[PDB]
């Protein structure tokens, strides 16, 4: 029945090599953008016009992540190593050192004064801001660290990997309280709690979204059609408008579920490589996708529903 | 056909373990799986990882005189934009 209406409005060009990930600020007010061209990107998420080329690592980088007052940002690079930004200034505050391997993913806790980070040394480790300072690092994995990513008040982090494992942290201790497996174990490429905390969304690379409860170890939904066998794509979930599920795709489509009834209600067509990325704006129902090397851009897409 | 890493050999053994070795390829590994059991057999294959940096390894806990299949996967790694994989892995078989 009801279905949304996304459409484009921006095409994001200017970074040279291919787009690793895409967020929007808190206060909706900027989009960052992490690229293989060792740059980060900030632009306006209402008219897409370019700001700031933020600069530092020495290789690649494959996430970046907001601070709660949109005033920091973190960036996890293939250098082995993290780094703070000041997104007024642009420059390097603290350097993160400690994951001896590819960092891949990165995170602010709700209260900003926590980082956490999963990397291909098969570890997470808890950051503390202000000083820089590894505080814990968990040895989660016995495969690189796909996605992690912290509950509504930051007491728990999830995390992903390509053993097939989704763990639950409590961030005070550092312990492990639940395992989520699957007999078949198909490498998890992307975890992530929902806005109330309550759920869990994980891709595997058998081209499928399932929506987790996470209280109790159970399954709720499934979520398919799309192409996802080999890269470690972003999931969200689109509560400002209707309530679906947006995920990038290797078919260069994104897809928009509906996370009730489980069914595809839009294809978002115009990029050229693999969607790896997408971003849902906090307050308007904009949506954000970027995608690889033979797709060096960002693209907008706002609808009505 | 094509494979990496190349030139998997055992180089010394005993009743109860295998030395393999192969061929560092020029292209640097993020790490090395090295899947083995009995050939042919129903039984599930054991396996543990290998630096990239290193080109050697020792198979123990054996046992003797039946046929092994010794198998070594090539991944490489890197950023979000490429994908995390193996190349062509290369097989042999040992009896012990």
Known sequence: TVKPNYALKFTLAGHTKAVSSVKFSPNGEWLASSSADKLIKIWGAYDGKFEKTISGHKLGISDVAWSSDSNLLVSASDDKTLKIWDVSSGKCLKTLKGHSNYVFCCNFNPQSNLIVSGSFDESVRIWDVKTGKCLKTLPAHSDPVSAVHFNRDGSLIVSSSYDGLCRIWDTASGQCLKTLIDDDNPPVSFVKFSPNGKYILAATLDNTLKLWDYSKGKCLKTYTGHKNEKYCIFANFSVTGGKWIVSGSEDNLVYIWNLQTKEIVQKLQGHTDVVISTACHPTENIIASAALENDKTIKLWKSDC | ?96
């Open chain 2, 1 to 96: 056909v094509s494979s990496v890493p190349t030139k998997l050999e055992v180089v010394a053994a005993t009743p109860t373990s295998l030395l393999i070795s192969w061929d560092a390829p020029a292209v640097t590994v993020v790490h090395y799986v090295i899947t083995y059991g009995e050939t042919g057999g129903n039984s599930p294959v054991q396996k543990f990882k290998v630096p990239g940096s290193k080109s050697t390894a020792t198979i123990s806990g054996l046992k003797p005189g039946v046929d092994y299949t010794i198998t070594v996967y090539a991944y490489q790694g890197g950023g979000r934009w490429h994908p995390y994989g193996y190349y062509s892995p290369i097989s042999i078989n040992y009896r012990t």
